[PDB]
Amino acid sequence: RGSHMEKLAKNKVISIDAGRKYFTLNQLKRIVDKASELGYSDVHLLLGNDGLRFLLDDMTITANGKTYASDDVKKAIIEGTKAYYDDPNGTALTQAEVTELIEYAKSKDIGLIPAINSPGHMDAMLVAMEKLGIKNPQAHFDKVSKTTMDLKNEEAMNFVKALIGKYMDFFAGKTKIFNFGTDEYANDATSAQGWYYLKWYQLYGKFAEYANTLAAMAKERGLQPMAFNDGFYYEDKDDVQFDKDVLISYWSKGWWGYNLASPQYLASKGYKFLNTNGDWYYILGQKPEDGGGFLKKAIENTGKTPFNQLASTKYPEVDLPTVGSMLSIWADRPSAEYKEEEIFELMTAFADHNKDYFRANYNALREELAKISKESLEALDAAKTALNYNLNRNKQAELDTLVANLKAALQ
């Protein structure tokens, strides 16, 4: 049970699935603002998750000894993403929009953590590849996957690695972490038994090297690699080795015949966790009747599930090292309406149940600071000096008073 300092140093992350579904820059700014207000440290933004919803200004890709022109890559990606879900609200964020988003979050002490999913959840990239002349990028098992790249297809792999590298190059120097996903390999084509299928066809070693290369690409570009736990040391076996520097976003140990590594086992291999507990999931539009991650359950679970409790473990009987925790908003059915206040209420309850971990609200202090002769310059200083930047969410009134004193002095 940490000191105030340890508690505040942990990441508090709100995750938004803008891979499946379009979110405007304004919508994401409002999320950033609300995250800042409630005391979160980061917004985790999925840009590639099924749909690919982010184009750089220059999308020229070099791979397979060949060159794929920027205009063609954009067109193919737009077609890929539209084939997955032609969202009426928009298709993809631009490079200027994400740059502005990052610079807005930074002004509020909020990090951005981008996620570009592969080799699963990459519907949009698969079709984009077909459009660029890359035949059969899809995994084939019980049927031809719509979500997952064939690991035997070197043409497709090289392209995707080049694509992901250009994304990484953009986020280099702008964000600390890059999440490359790897959750649910070929779920759609194996009845959600993808890992078993990879092991069956002796392609799991091939998955690992793919995962290890993305990890290496991230580190080389000065980005801390992150990935979902699913495909790491599946079934607690270690004949296939994984990069030990990946931050594991741990969400679940899986279900009958989806026998993921335990958090105990990954901690024994040296891993650090971002606690992305499935208990906190909310899928837009999910009703109580539907079961699963509906709003009332997620809200209840921010109460029942301790901040540090990794899925499948009881806290504190099992106490594993985490850098923080992440509450996740998903868009499984992307035509469900995004209701801002649902997300806000859920964000609020997670903060309200963990006040020791969340910062106080510094938006009014910032607003006041940017408003700035005699012994009245002496006063403005003594108020400036009395500012405390270390206050948690339990101490908002204390902060309000310090801000009130500084307002007084500036008048």
**Interface stretch with ligand OAN, choices 26-34, 53-61, 156-164, 247-255 (CB under 6 A):** 247-255
For ligand OAN, the closer CB: 79 or 184: 184
Q: How far is the CB of 155 from ligand OAN (least distance, A)?
A: 26
Nearer to ligand OAN, 280 or 362 (CB): 280
Asked if 196 is part of the footprint of ligand OAN (rule: CB under 6 A), the reply reads: no
Q: How far apart are the two ends of the chain, measured CA to CA in Å? A: 43
Q: Which is nearer to ligand OAN, 232 or 281 (CB)?
A: 281
Give strand ranges (E) for 119-216: 138-140, 144-149, 177-181
Q: Which of 144, 192, 336, 364 binds ligand OAN (CB under 6 A)?
A: 192
Is residue 268 within 8 A of residue 236, CB to CB? The reply is no
Cβ atoms of 185 and 195 within 8 Å: the answer is: yes
22 binds ligand OAN (CB under 6 A): no
Size of the site for ligand OAN (CB under 6 A): 14
Q: Does 195 bind ligand OAN (CB under 6 A)?
A: no
Residue number, 48 or 165, with CB nearest to ligand OAN: 48
* Beta carbons of 217 and 248 less than 8 angstroms apart: no
String marking each residue 325-344 x if it binds ligand OAN according to CB under 6 A: -----x-x------------
Choice between 251 and 271, CB closer to ligand OAN: 251
Between residue 71 and residue 130, which ones bind ligand OAN under the rule CB under 6 A? none
User: Alpha helices of 278-362 — where are they, by DSSP H?
Assistant: 295-304, 340-352
Q: Which of 39, 23, 56, 211 is nearest to 119 (CA)?
A: 211
Classified as helix, coil or strand, 238 is: coil
Q: Does 256 bind ligand OAN (CB under 6 A)?
A: no
Cβ-based nearer residue to ligand OAN, 167 or 185: 185
Q: Which residues contact 168 (CB under 8 A, 6 or more apart)?
A: 178, 217, 218, 221, 223
Does residue 362 belong to the site contacting ligand OAN (CB under 6 A)? no
Stretch that binds ligand OAN, among 145-153, 155-163, 250-258, 314-322 (CB under 6 A): 250-258
Inter-CA distances, 264 with 2, 200, 225, 261, 309, Å:
21, 25, 21, 8, 12
**Out of 104, 196, 258, 265, which residue is the one contacting ligand OAN (CB under 6 A)?**
258
Q: Give the tokens for residue 306.
A: 């301790």
**Quick one: CA dihedral 372, 373, 376, 377, positive or negative?**
positive
Binding site for ligand OAN (CB under 6 A): 17, 183-184, 192, 228, 251, 254-255, 258, 281, 283, 293, 330, 332
